[PDB]
Write a protein that binds this DNA or RNA. Sequence first.
DNA 1: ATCAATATCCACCTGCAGATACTACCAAAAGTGTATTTGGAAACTGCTCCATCAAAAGGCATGTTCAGCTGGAATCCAGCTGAACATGCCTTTTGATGGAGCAGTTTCCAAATACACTTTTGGTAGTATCTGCAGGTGGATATTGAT
DNA 2: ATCAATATCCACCTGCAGATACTACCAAAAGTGTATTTGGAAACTGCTCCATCAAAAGGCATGTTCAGCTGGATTCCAGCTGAACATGCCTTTTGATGGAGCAGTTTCCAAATACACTTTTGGTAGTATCTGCAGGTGGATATTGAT
Lengths: 106, 107, 98, 98, 82, 79, 94, 94
Amino acid sequence: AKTRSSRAGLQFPVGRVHRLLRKGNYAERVGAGAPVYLAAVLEYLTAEILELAGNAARDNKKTRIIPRHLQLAVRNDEELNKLLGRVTIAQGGVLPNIQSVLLPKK
Amino acid sequence: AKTRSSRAGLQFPVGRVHRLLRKGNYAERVGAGAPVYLAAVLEYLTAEILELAGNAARDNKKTRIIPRHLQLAVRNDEELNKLLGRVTIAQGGVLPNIQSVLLPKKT
Amino acid sequence: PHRYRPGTVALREIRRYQKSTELLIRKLPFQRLVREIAQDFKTDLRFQSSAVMALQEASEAYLVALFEDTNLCAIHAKRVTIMPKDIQLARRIRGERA
Amino acid sequence: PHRYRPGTVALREIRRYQKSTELLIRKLPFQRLVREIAQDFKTDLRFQSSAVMALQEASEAYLVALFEDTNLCAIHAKRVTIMPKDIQLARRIRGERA
Amino acid sequence: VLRDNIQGITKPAIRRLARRGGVKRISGLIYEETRGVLKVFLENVIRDAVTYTEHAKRKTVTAMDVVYALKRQGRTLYGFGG
Amino acid sequence: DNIQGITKPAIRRLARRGGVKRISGLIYEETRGVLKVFLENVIRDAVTYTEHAKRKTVTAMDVVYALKRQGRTLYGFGG
Amino acid sequence: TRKESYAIYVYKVLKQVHPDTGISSKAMSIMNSFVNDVFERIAGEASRLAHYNKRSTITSREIQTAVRLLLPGELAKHAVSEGTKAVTKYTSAK
Amino acid sequence: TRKESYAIYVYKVLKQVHPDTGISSKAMSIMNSFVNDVFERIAGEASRLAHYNKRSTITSREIQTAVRLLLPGELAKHAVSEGTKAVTKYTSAK
DNA sequence: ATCAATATCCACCTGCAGATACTACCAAAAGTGTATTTGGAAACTGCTCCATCAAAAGGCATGTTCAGCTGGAATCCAGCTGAACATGCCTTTTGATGGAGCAGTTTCCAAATACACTTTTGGTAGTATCTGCAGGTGGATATTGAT
DNA sequence: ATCAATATCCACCTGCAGATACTACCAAAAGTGTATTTGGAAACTGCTCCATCAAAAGGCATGTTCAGCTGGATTCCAGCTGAACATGCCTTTTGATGGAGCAGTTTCCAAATACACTTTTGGTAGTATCTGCAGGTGGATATTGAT
């Protein structure tokens, strides 16, 4: 017996997503393509964030992705930043930003 | 055979509210006490806004509550204003309000 | 000839428009704008009239509420004349463009 | 007798705290504040350590972002010194106020 | 052929809205500023409304699609079945 | 008092992370007051979820759910 | 084919609070959106509350907690009374 | 009692994207919250979509419209692409 | 203060869009009565983890002195923006017409629920070892600021 | 432009908190085969209502003139807020020791679901008749601004 994830060619657990859609009371029924589609959309977004967080980890001479790296990856990306606009990432800090009028007159 | 609303001493339809809770997929089961309670809350809230709107309709020498009256009654009430803080009542307009500094002369 | 001083009519107008609820943007012009923007998204669309009216009630309530916040930013700047920067400051704080 | 000019060290601090993520309010003092407030809704409550830490991370992130908005309102007013009215204006526009 | 209808949002109509918003004095650049702001607001709402329309396989935008689009944006509207 | 336990230096460090350079003396009391309204709102909700579950211990999850319905979603503490 | 609304019930309550006052259809439409909106928000809170507690049933209790979560201080205190009251009455009738 | 989490499937995706990069427990906890959050936002919108159209089934179509409604421009285009892809590849397999 | 040009208020009132009244029909809603199924309260309680307490360590907060420099008050003035006016466009409106397309009734099978069975798995636990990097030491070098 | 005082950066190092790893146990979970049921696409189409066209018209937009007064620029100085200390109060680490109570397991019964009928009702379609108030009219009061 081969798993549903393996068939759809995914890492995320298609069977779990299906089970979760059902026990969530989203609808009376849940077509079979739905947990596949959704599982892949979740994997992708995970890949997009881990890809950028990873770069951030590189740019900081580090190999281990920490909350800081996830915050920099999200706030420096226009789309991810919007999608997570009302979200607070614990121990993320903020982007280095100083209003120009506050800088020395030179 | 009385209606569940009369059994509860309510005007709002308990049978309907119980029915809507099921078709909205909120949980696998809906206890018979849920719609009774919820129908009471809806009625009370409806009563509260109608009370105030009816008064706003009197202050403007009107017999019929129109949308402006509902807006006046919600804006002028701190709590109904909080509960409907992200709501737009069509044809409601706004509350007469002019920032002080915009007024003429001094003293 | 009689002439009201600058600002008197503006105030007369505020009391006037704050007292009424009718829509302030012309009907048909607003309808062409909606059909233009929608068309640029999907050709061959039709609109229930109430759908157009719904958007006009939402847009105007949004603009009025926006001008209130804008007016407060101007007053904060010790002005009584709103400018693009005020609108921009309100939209930024509102998180419409943080 | 060395002495840095007003603003140089403050600016130096902005750069320092914007690079780190550690919480900035002392923990025990915060925990006390939390327990006191809750005591007002329900007596004899216990708090998971992770619960308190969740409140803190949420509160600081909230205050920090509010200072960003506040700072923009002070700057809007052509100042570099944030004041209560800047906080009020920011909260009012966010809808957390009026 | 629909072109430049954003200009249908006239200076007087924008002044009136400002008046209801409690505004006394308007700078000359506010009119273009407001048209730009309105257009973005309508693009976002119509985009969602039309998306609800297509999903239902209709060619007609209903008052409800609009009402549902508005609620997603946190602009709940009362009075149109919505 | 406790709210007064949130020291000036800490409110200053907070402002710094928020990019603030100069701070008026009235800010410290303003802030404390704002912080208290924030925590009362969030805790009021967490405790409500706590009582509903018939517990006497506020859990991280209770807080996270409170934050989510206040539109302040928080990642990292479960949920 | 059938289109339900709270019109007949809004109206009954209207005559209780204001015997000689009417309501325009446009205002009634708004009242109807209001009742639906609050209903959904309340059932939504309850729904989630139930799930957060691995409960598959939404009883008057979840409804009560939702109300406390959703309404401002004073509207909640009264809503809770009316509800508890309607449930107590209902319970002793059958 | 067991406590599920998306941690393992996250780590798997991590090593594909950055084979020589690790992730801290706290960062993993953040990624789990993220996956749970997007799942709920996505499922919830599909829910409403089905309801609005008087449908009792959430198909891959509702998940698609939900994704278009929820995600920003490009993120949306690609997610749709990945989505269609996995559903196609899944069908072309006994 | 006096006065005159206008806006504002309101009583009086007519026309009518919209609200109110009623009989009719009826399909979906809502209630009654059983038989059948089970969610979750209730009591007992093992184990996790929260509340405490000892308690130097010393870090970080507080009180103070000094003066740099920012905020707020005052002054001047170019020209932006409001008020009023003339002109006449185009939105609003009353109203009919075709027909697109939304929506109702129905026929019907691809697809989902419902189980029962078998098999695979990811989470909990230990037990033991491995390592990315926070944190400390130097020493170079840039930044800040007085001259 | 020079030059002392500090901060900031960096290359290197070591210890440990926490990430990695092999083994093992196991209940819940995921896949599979079979029987039964149904959601909702299809096809046909009744019928609502959207897009158009027509026309008369005056409400209202556009464009210009003009000057009141607001915003912008500039100057000025009182005093607040930052920097730098000297001081010492209490946050912080943490080790550990009761024990609260969260969470797992077993019961078992009020309450929910399923199911078959009967009675009730809100919504709708067809006409038909009131009524609150919008909007016009005329004239008395109130507001505003020049003198």
